[PDB]
Design a protein around this ligand. Structure first.
Ligand SMILES: Nc1ncnc2c1ncn2[C@@H]1O[C@H](COP(=O)(O)OP(=O)(O)OP(=O)(O)O)[C@@H](O)[C@H]1O
Ligand SMILES: [Mg+2]
Lengths: 395, 831
């Protein structure tokens, strides 16, 4: 307390200093999206505002007299107008093709720069940019499943040399199916963490849209954007939202959604080659999927995430009880035997609830009795709401 | 008005009336009750007697009682009431006075809040008291002999250390330290040594050392001695211990710091003790983890470049560094450990110099097996390969001390070779092999090279870098004498050459971290001409205060940074920016102030001023990939100034050196695509990828270990050698002297946590690894790790994560769970 008076004097002087420092340094405000003044190259911006002129985005439609020395280009300037223009002197004639987006000026509308194809911002955000914090070491009881998943979606990209030499075309699709909590998305999250190619996450509910032809359109732009990369991965979590089997119920039952599935089926295996995309589908209801989608060439590998066995459940218990402050003699083999048909999600809850019984008792170490009570609360007491009994019939 | 409050308000008159009577019969019962009256409200911390606050003017009636007659009992309790009243107001020379003159009973009897006020005033008047007032501190020392025991009794121990610190009497703290609170005082005091200035730096360090020595906590006592750089104390600390198991673990810390101790044969277990500190078993221990962590497989630079996901002599030289950096200290590689002649000859000009030297970096710390592979390239007729191998000699012994040195034998007869390249691989290699040794035989063999007439400026600077690295932080006057002697003999024109910049660095390294030992050297530097004298004195002055945090020293460096020149005159400006990093790096608080200043230098500074900011970022946070710096370095990666562009990209890899950051590698891969058409920029990009994946994520370049409190002089020497050389990245790094990047080998150490048994065999147990938490202040048991995970011991700890044993089955010898640690079975466990 003898320094309480001296603390506030230097604290207030400090707070006055930051307020003083920010006065000369600047960076106050940001509501208009202003960068800190240390990054202001105002000399270049003034030149940029003059030397670099703005360019209107237009789409080339038809090239007239491409063979001759006077090739005229018809452009569609979005909602503005249509113009027959010629190329600029700084762009090669072979760099502009019909149907591609171009940048045109506001005076003579001459094409100045070819542009990337238009892609829905929603589809762009569907690509993964921060890899998840899940590795293959966090998945227990899925050894054989994981090798099959890696050798299709991870190995060919990592070491492509061992497939071209033998004339091998690796499978370009994997379907992960199993009851909820079995680890379908967990293994996919492990794939994204390890993969170095582009990973796109698609949820089947994201492909359901208000207007007619959107879900097919978003699939088209999804694969169009995936094809602009040397290697790509598309994850379709809960494909059964749009992957349901086609049917005719008199009325237009699920006609629009079926078209979205048909477009996805067309991109996977149609007239045109798909590219270097390896798709990954996860669903807890594989019985509802369309037969054409469940066909090799679209879903070549069908990896089943069945309920873990005794060895697998013991492995999952160790994974989730790795960081627990457990006792010395916790019989995890016994715990795995007390939940015969239990998902890995239940085992995680058992581990979490086991520490909850100890935290409730103000104990810093969870005994084996807490895990025994956790199994009764999770595996037994919560067995009324278990999704396993109904979903094993679907898988 | 409460009646009980009015009852005390009555005592302002009737009790004073009892003290107003001439007879002393009524004095004692009133004063004794008055003395106890204060304790009535003292029992509650918040409750204070407000009627007593109205008795302050009443002291005039009591003025004669406590002053004008005998001090037996009349003044005794009369003054103490004023002392409690002196707590309320300013109390300048009053609150202490009545307690000093009045009753001298147990101090805590008047309250914890009263003594806390009293203790603070003790230090206040102590500064006021002069030398002639030594006859006034007799009762002052008595209180501190009782205040300190009271503070530690009620866990208010951090307040106690504060009392002795202000009065400069921290000497008497150790006598009263108890078993239950030794850890709190030392941890508190050691945290204070990074902010108190000289001479109280050592004094607080020695006093904290005394507590550890008395309490038989030798391993932590040795850490304090190493921070003090007291070689005699290190001898005394080591030999005093009779527990050889503690001594074996202690020898690891000396080896990790690179400090060698010459033991006597009479000391028991002499053999293993020298082996442990010499790091001869480091190669096998490091290889043991590699087999355990199933990452022994070699990595080609293609696996790092990952060009199949992307939508020349310099290219070949870049991949030589990437191959060496990624497979550093491993002994196996698919590109050079195989038949590398096709790859080795793919490089050209000096590209083969670093490529041949890169071969020894895969064999780092493997002196026996590594020298078995270089011999093939040692007989090459092409001049670059042999001297590149000659430098690869120094790498293979770097960080290891051999009882008889192989490297000197392979390099002694090539320091005076007629061809300059052959020397170039000799002195630079010889420097890395014995960096931080201060050994006279090599220095005497290395010294005349600098003064050689045929010795070009390139090798002369290399000689300064080497001899500076051998005698780093030793203030060896012999190396000092020649470095000055070469400097002023040189002509003014050749001082324009940037290879002369290495001469002050060698001088600076020789006085690394000494501080006040440069004024005699700075005196000699005034004779040297400008602008090199401006460059020379700045370099040595910065190196003198390296890892000190002296705010006074960094005050002058920004004064150099304030005056901007409209290049040739501002050559010394780069070191000044690099100076802030070298001084503030000591502790975290000083370090991240530097980032804020580093932002303004990148903003208001001149090109030459801002060309050194990225290197300062690399120095301030080497192998610590924080997002603020990485985002900062990313923004200036594509800078208009080419040097800032190269320097930022190198710093980005340097900041995440050996961290294997997945996010950072993506930025470099993106940077590779952007700078694909720029050969100069792309070379730094490839260099950063190799450093990012240095040792496949198992090597660090950070100079600080032992919970980031103990500084390795060897590591900074390699750190300084590369970064100072990067002030001229165009001519040195991008030119013909890119071998200087091998100075980073002197700083290459494993991010290690290996638990050994008492017989030194591996002992894998469950450990908790998580971000370090400051636990100064808060009493009880605070957690030192947050967001932790449980792993087996053979795990890699990046910057800023501590390690705690998950169970209590084993008792660690050192509280610091870093490097090689010996575990002892807990007798309490399995009771
Ligand atoms: N094999 C496993 N090993 C370890 N943990 C597992 C395993 N399977 C599931 N879990 C845990 O259970 C959680 C269940 O989520 P997860 O994404 O794996 O479910 P899912 O199989 O995709 O289910 P749903 O069909 O409902 O989508 C995971 O987040 C993980 O923590
Ligand atoms: Mg799922």
């Amino acid at each position: 307390s003898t320094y309480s008076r001296q603390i506030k004097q230097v604290e207030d002087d400090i707070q006055q200093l930051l307020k003083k420092i920010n006065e000369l340094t600047g960076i106050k405000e940001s509501d208009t999206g202003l960068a800190p003044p240390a990054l202001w190259d105002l000399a270049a911006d003034k030149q940029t505002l003059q030397s670099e002129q703005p360019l209107q985005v237009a789409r080339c439609t038809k090239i007239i007299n491409a063979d001759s020395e006077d090739p005229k280009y018809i452009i569609n300037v979005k909602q503005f107008a249509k113009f027959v223009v010629d190329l600029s002197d700084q762009v090669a004639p072979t760099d502009i093709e019909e149907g591609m987006r171009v940048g045109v000026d506001r005076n003579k509308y001459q094409i100045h720069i070819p542009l990337p194809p238009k892609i829905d911002p929603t589809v762009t955000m569907m690509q993964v940019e921060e890899k998840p914090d899940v590795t293959y070491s966090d998945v227990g009881g899925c050894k054989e499943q994981i090798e099959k998943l890696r050798e299709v979606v991870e190995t060919p990209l990592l070491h492509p040399e061992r497939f071209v030499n033998l004339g091998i075309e690796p499978p370009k699709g994997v379907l992960l199916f199993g009851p909820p909590g079995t680890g379908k998305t967990l293994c996919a999250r492990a794939v994204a963490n390890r993969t170095d190619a582009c990973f796109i996450r698609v949820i089947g509910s994201e492909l359901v849209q208000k207007y007619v032809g959107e879900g097919a359109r978003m699939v088209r732009e999804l694969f169009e954007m995936a094809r602009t990369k040397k290697a790509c991965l598309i994850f379709f979590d809960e494909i059964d939202a749009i992957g349901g089997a086609r049917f005719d119920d008199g009325a237009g039952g699920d006609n629009e959604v079926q078209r979205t599935m048909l477009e996805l089926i067309n991109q996977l295996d149609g007239f045109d080659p798909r590219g270097n995309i390896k798709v990954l589908m996860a669903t807890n209801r594989p019985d509802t999927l369309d037969p054409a989608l469940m066909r090799p060439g679209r879903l070549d590998r069908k990896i089943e995430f069945s309920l873990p066995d005794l060895e697998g459940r013991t492995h999952i218990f160790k994974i989730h009880a790795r960081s627990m402050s457990v006792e010395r003699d916790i019989r995890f083999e016994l715990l795995a035997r007390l939940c015969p048909n239990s998902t890995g999600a239940e085992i995680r809850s058992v581990c979490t609830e086991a520490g909850m019984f100890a935290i409730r008792a103000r104990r810093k170490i969870a005994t084996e009795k807490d895990f025994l009570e956790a199994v009764n609360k999770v595996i037994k007491s919560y067995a009324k709401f278990s999704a396993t009994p109904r979903y094993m019939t679907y898988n | 008005l409460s009646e009980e409050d009015k009852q005390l308000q009555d005592e302002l008159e009737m009790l004073v009336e009892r003290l107003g009577e001439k007879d002393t019969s009524l004095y004692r019962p009133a004063l004794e009750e008055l003395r106890r009256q204060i304790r009535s409200s003292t029992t509650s911390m918040t409750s204070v007697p407000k009627p007593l606050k109205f008795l302050r003017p009443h002291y005039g009636k009591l003025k004669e009682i406590y002053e004008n007659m005998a001090p037996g009992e009349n003044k005794r309790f009369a003054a103490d009431i004023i002392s409690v009243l002196a707590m309320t107001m300013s109390g300048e020379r009053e609150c202490l006075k009545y307690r000093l003159v009045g009753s001298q009973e147990e101090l805590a009897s008047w309250g914890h809040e009263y003594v806390r006020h009293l203790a603070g005033e003790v230090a206040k008047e102590w500064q006021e008291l002069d030398d002639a007032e030594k006859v006034q501190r007799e009762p002052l020392l008595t209180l501190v002999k009782e205040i300190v025991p009271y503070n530690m009794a009620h866990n208010a121990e951090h307040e106690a250390c504060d009392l002795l610190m202000e009065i400069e009497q921290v000497d008497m703290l150790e006598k009263d330290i108890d078993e239950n609170a030794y850890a709190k005082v030392c941890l508190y005091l050691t945290s204070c040594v990074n902010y108190v200035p000289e001479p109280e730096n050592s004094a607080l360090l020695r006093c904290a050392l005394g507590v550890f020595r008395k309490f038989s906590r030798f391993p932590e006592a040795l850490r304090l001695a190493l921070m003090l750089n007291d070689m005699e104390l290190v001898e005394d600390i080591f030999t005093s211990c009779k527990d050889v198991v503690v001594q074996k673990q202690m020898a690891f810390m000396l080896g990790r710091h690179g400090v060698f101790l010459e033991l006597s044969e009479d000391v028991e277990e002499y053999e293993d003790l020298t082996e442990i500190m010499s790091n001869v078993q480091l190669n096998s221990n490091f290889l043991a983890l590699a087999r355990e962590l199933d990452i022994m497989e070699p990595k080609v630079p293609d696996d790092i470049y990952k060009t199949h996901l992307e939508n020349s002599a310099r290219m070949n030289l870049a991949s030589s560094f990437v191959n060496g950096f990624v497979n550093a200290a491993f002994g196996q590689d698919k590109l050079l450990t195989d038949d590398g002649n096709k790859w080795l000859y793919k490089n050209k000009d000096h590209g083969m110099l670093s490529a041949a030297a890169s071969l020894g970096m895969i064999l780092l710390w493997d002196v026996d097996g590594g020298l078995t592979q270089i011999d093939k390239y040692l007989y090459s007729s092409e001049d670059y390969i042999k001297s590149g191998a000659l430098l690869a000699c120094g790498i293979v012994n770097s960080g290891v001390r051999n009882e008889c040195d192989p490297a000197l034998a392979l390099l002694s007869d090539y320091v005076l070779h007629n061809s300059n390249t052959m020397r170039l691989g000799s002195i630079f290699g010889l420097g890395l092999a014995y960096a931080g040794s201060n050994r006279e035989d090599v220095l005497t063999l290395l010294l005349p090279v600098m003064g050689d007439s045929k010795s070009s400026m390139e090798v002369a600077g290399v000689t300064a870098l080497a001899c500076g690295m051998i005698a780093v932080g030793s203030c060896n006057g012999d190396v000092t004498s020649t470095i000055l002697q070469t400097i002023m003999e040189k002509s003014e024109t050749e001082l324009k050459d940037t290879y002369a910049r290495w001469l002050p660095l060698g001088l600076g390294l020789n006085h690394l971290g000494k501080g006040e030992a440069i004024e005699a050297i700075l005196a000699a530097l005034e004779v040297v001409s400008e602008p090199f004298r401006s460059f020379a004195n700045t370099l040595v002055d910065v190196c003198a205060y390296a890892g000190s945090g002296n705010v006074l020293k960094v005050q002058q460096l920004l004064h150099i940074c304030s005056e901007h020149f409209d290049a040739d005159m501002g050559a010394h400006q780069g070191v000044a920016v690099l100076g802030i990093a070298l001084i503030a790096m000591g502790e975290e608080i000083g370090a991240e102030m530097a980032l804020r200043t580093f932002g303004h230098l990148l903003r208001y500074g001149e090109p030459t001023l801002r060309r050194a900011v990225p290197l300062a970022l690399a120095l301030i946070s080497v192998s610590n990939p924080r997002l603020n710096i990485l985002d900062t370095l990313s923004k200036f990666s594509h800078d208009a100034d080419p040097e800032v562009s190269y320097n930022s990209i190198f710093a980005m890899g340097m900041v995440g050196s050996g961290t294997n950051n997945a996010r950072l590698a993506a930025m470099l891969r993106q940077l590779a695509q952007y700078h694909a058409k720029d050969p100069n920029n792309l070379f730094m990009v490839r260099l950063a990828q190799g450093l990012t994946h240095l040792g496949k994520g198992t090597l660090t370049l950070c100079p600080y270990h032992s919970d980031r409190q103990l500084m390795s002089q060897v590591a900074v020497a390699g750190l300084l050698t590369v970064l100072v050389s990067f002030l001229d990245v165009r001519n040195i790094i991008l030119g013909k002297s890119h071998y200087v990047l091998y100075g980073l080998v002197a700083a290459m150490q494993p991010r290690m946590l290996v638990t050994f048994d008492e017989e030194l065999r591996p002992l894998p147990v469950s450990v908790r690894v998580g971000q370090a938490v400051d636990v100064v202040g808060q009493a009880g048991k605070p957690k030192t790790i947050t967001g932790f995970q449980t792993h087996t011991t053979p795990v890699l700890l990046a910057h800023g994560e501590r390690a705690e044993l998950a169970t209590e089955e084993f008792l660690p010898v050192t509280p610091i769970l870093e490097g090689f640690v010996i575990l002892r079975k807990n007798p309490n466990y399995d009771l």
